Amino acid sequence: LKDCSVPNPSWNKDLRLLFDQFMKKCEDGSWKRLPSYKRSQAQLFTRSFDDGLGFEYVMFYNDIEKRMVCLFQGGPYLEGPPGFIHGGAIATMIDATVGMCAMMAGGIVMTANLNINYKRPIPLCSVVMINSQLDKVEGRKFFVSCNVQSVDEKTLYSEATSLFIKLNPAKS
Amino acid sequence: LKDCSVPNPSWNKDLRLLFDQFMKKCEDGSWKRLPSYKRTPTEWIQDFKTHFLDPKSQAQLFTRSFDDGLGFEYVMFYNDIEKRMVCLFQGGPYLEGPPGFIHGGAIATMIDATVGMCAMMAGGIVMTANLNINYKRPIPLCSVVMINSQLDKVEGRKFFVSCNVQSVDEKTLYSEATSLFIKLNPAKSLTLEHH
Ligand SMILES: CCCCCCCCC[C@@H](O)CSCCNC(=O)CCNC(=O)[C@H](O)C(C)(C)COP(=O)(O)OP(=O)(O)OC[C@H]1O[C@@H](n2cnc3c(N)ncnc32)[C@H](O)[C@@H]1OP(=O)(O)O
Ligand SMILES: CCCCCCCCC[C@@H](O)CSCCNC(=O)CCNC(=O)[C@H](O)C(C)(C)COP(=O)(O)OP(=O)(O)OC[C@H]1O[C@@H](n2cnc3c(N)ncnc32)[C@H](O)[C@@H]1OP(=O)(O)O
């Protein structure tokens, strides 16, 4: 049972720096780091590449603010347009972030809607901040939105909205 | 240039039988099989870098980064007169999200791949601007689905594509999506559109 949401030697300096800043944020308990594990042959999609090759990320959650931040570094195996991250790898990390935000707020959910605007392409081996927030809850409906930005927060790469439906275990 | 859109021992009978059916559809010439590779063909890399975007590898196509059967297994067939691209897709165990089912991002990925390849046939080098997915029913691991996309309208550099994700018998609708793709303006050119 290995935790992948901790620094390894594939991590760019920018990702290490940001991770350290968010670990400091965790000092008073207002933020908290989420461990992540690999998982027949079935494995978690975002944790199925070797180190550095696929998704490298850590999530930090702020309960008071119902906010999830994903620090994310995309490896060479996530390529779409030459030199950039595939639009589906972006959707994947968006979904994993906004979904985990809903799940920390309110428990088990599944994505019903995912609406992504790609504003600027993301360079392969770059590091981004996915910042999501729970906007409103309406019964079983969780409305989470987010944005993907450069580490320095100058560049806006993507914006997304999403709807998660809390499952009713007495039905599934 | 090894073609990954051909049958291999991981392809279950439904993927294999549905490949044969679309291969039959290709005989009259109305449909055509697309190849797919682990890496973009060097002609398109050259074109892309030299005229559009170069950010200054082990690089390989996201959808083709899994060994046989574990990830995305797929083939695309295109109909030019219908402006319609169909992807036959089988999702392996490494695509798991909810236990037993394909991750929403791996569904988004195969949707993006399909609608994106549809936009490219009509528009050349394009990139995703919007991708709007409704996930209606969960897709079980190792199931074979069809992604059916069509180009709905072209307006300047805008290509609007729709699609559906369906079971082989078409009775179960897993997902539906809409999308906007945008034909890239070369880096050294003006557009010269409104704005
Ligand atoms: C052969 C095998 C190879 C395999 C291939 C392998 C892999 C395949 C690769 C795959 O992985 C798929 S690429 C997947 C990842 N995609 C991206 O990263 C795209 C990032 N975005 C951009 O680079 C730019 O934003 C883009 C180039 C898209 C547009 O940038 P520009 O060109 O500068 O566009 P303008 O800003 O002048 O806007 C143009 C018009 O569009 C409108 N518009 C724009 N965005 C919109 C939105 N989100 N909703 C609604 N509308 C939107 C806008 O209002 C305007 O309309 P008007 O206002 O009516 O004029
Ligand atoms: C699982 C553990 C996580 C693992 C960790 C991995 C994590 C990675 C995460 C990824 O893996 C992602 S989870 C994997 C990807 N997700 C899926 O495949 C979900 C497929 N969908 C479904 O199973 C069902 O549609 C769902 C369970 C979503 C809802 O099924 P039901 O329970 O039958 O709910 P109802 O259908 O009665 O509708 C409920 C309400 O929502 C409204 N609505 C529904 N869809 C809508 C849409 N698209 N737009 C707008 N609205 C929509 C609807 O109008 C209704 O509203 P009201 O009638 O006004 O109340």
Question: How many residue pairs from chains A and B have C-beta atoms closer than 8 A?
Answer: 155
Asked how this structure was determined, the answer is X-ray
- Resolution, expressed in angstroms to one decimal: 2.3
Peptide bond into B192 cis (omega under 30): yes
Enter the tokens of residue B169: 């018998």
Enter the tokens of residue A153: 């927060």
Who contacts A59 (Cβ-Cβ below 8 Å, separation ≥6)?
Answer: A5, A33, A34, A36, A68, A69, A70, A71, A97, A100
How many alpha carbons lie under 13 Å from residue B104 in its C-beta half-sphere?
29
Q: Which residues span the domain enclosing B39?
A: 1-195
DSSP A36: -
- As to burial, measured by CB atoms within 10 angstroms (0-12 exposed, 13-18 middle, 19+ buried), residue B36 is buried
Ligand 2 cavity residues, CB under 6 Å = A 95-96, 99, 108, 110-113, 139-141, 163, 165; B 97-98, 103-104, 134-138
Enter the tokens of residue A95: 């979904």
Cβ of residue B108 closer than 8 Å to a chain A Cβ: yes
What is the CATH classification number for the domain harbouring A78?
3.10.129.10
Please tell me which of the candidates A43, A80, A83 has its beta carbon nearest to residue B62: A80
Spatial CA neighbour of B142 closest among B102, B105, B99: B102
Distances in whole angstroms, Cα of residue A52 to Cα of each of A35, A86, A123, A125, A126: 17, 16, 15, 9, 12
Spatial CA neighbour of B58 closest among A49, A81, A75, A122: A75
DSSP code per residue over B124-167: SSEEEEEEEEEE-SPPBTT-EEEEEEEEEEEETTEEEEEEEEEE
* Structural domains counted in chain B: 1
Distance CA A160, CA B6 (A): 35
Distance CA B99, CA B140 (A): 9
What's the helix, strand, coil split of chain B in %, to 5? 25, 35, 40
